[PDB]
Amino acid sequence: HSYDWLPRLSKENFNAAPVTCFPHAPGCEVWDNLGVGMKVEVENTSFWVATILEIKGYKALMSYEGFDTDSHDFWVNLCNAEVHSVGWCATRGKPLIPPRTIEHKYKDWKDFLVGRLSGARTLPSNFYNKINDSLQSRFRLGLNLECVDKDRISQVRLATVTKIVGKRLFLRYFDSDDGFWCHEDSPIIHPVGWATTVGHNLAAPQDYLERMLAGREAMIEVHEDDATIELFKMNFTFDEYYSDGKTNSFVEGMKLEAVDPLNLSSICPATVMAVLKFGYMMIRIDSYQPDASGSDWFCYHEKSPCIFPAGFCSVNNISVTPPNGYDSRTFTWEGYLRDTGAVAAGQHLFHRIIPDHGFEVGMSLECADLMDPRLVCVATVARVVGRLLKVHFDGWTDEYDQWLDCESADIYPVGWCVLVNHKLEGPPR
């Protein structure tokens, strides 16, 4: 049973994140052409005109025209239900039929509707045509892409898109039936030939390996089911780097803070282990238990919102997870740079810009568990540190939380699961 927001929508003072807060959400760009109190043609519970009283995410509180008591109002899902802009039924040759309760209430329906609609606001004619178009994913079934090995995050494995829910892809690895769910805009998936040019560890078939090696510049062997660079959302452009892609910003051995990719509830000191090309770099979480295989190393890009300069947690009052061998109370950066004798990463190397993301503490939303991406659960914004968010799951401990960026592809507006037919995990029983 998927959790329903209905008993929580009805309550007053229920703060919910607006769709516009989510760049990756469908209908996000046309949500500004939609305002509170617009007249719409809606299914008559045959269509009838109604008014949008409240808008909480995708959920919309609607009231018929002819009902002036807030006791016959009803909640709908805007992008699912048979809602259209006014004048649509006319083109479809369908007559607007008044509800049974008010069918005798007014004398001249002409001057009533005319009065209600004269100078009234409504949706653009091409509104829901832009919704369904925004529902589609850039990826299709059968596409092959390099993505981070969840059993060895130091390398990327060749995988295949075997299931698409909205814009969340299920990637099945090549040598296995094991796999993981992932949003198309997430930075853990990469086009064919990404690890080859970047310099990232790659696990793939022997033929694929030879194929990447045999390739010389812009002419590499590409197959019909290969996902190429045109389908992958980046936080940067190759214009910002030279031809060879050799970066000179970060250097090996630099120390910084970073979100633990394996435990999203923790920001920890991290070490620049290997500097790859085009700003990509392999870092290691310092709290990680020792490993000499380097298989615990993880790839963050230098323009990632999930890496921070040292002291970022102290300044913004965040409980920083100490490195291995250090205790909570007894940890300072000055004392830690004294021990290792390593320079902290420059403040200039980090470029953090806080957008008008409009996220406020208390705003309810639907969030996906990173450590079990099959689940998208009921959540709530706990903290707003600049552009960094701290998302909490309703009905769980504060250690199950996760530090997500405001523009993460793992957060969704309320009613998203109902829109894309995904199962929404609610609070425990």
Binding site: S85, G87, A90, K94, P95, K110, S118, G119, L123, S125
Partner: peptide, 26 residues
């Protein structure tokens, strides 16, 4: 720039038809 525009809409009922002018964001 996003601005308001006048949209002539039609409404069908038994047994006639009429038109009203509304606003839409574009």
């Amino acid at each position: 720039s996003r601005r308001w525009e006048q949209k002539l809409v039609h409404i069908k009922t038994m047994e006639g038809e009429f038109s009203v002018t509304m606003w839409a964001s574009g």
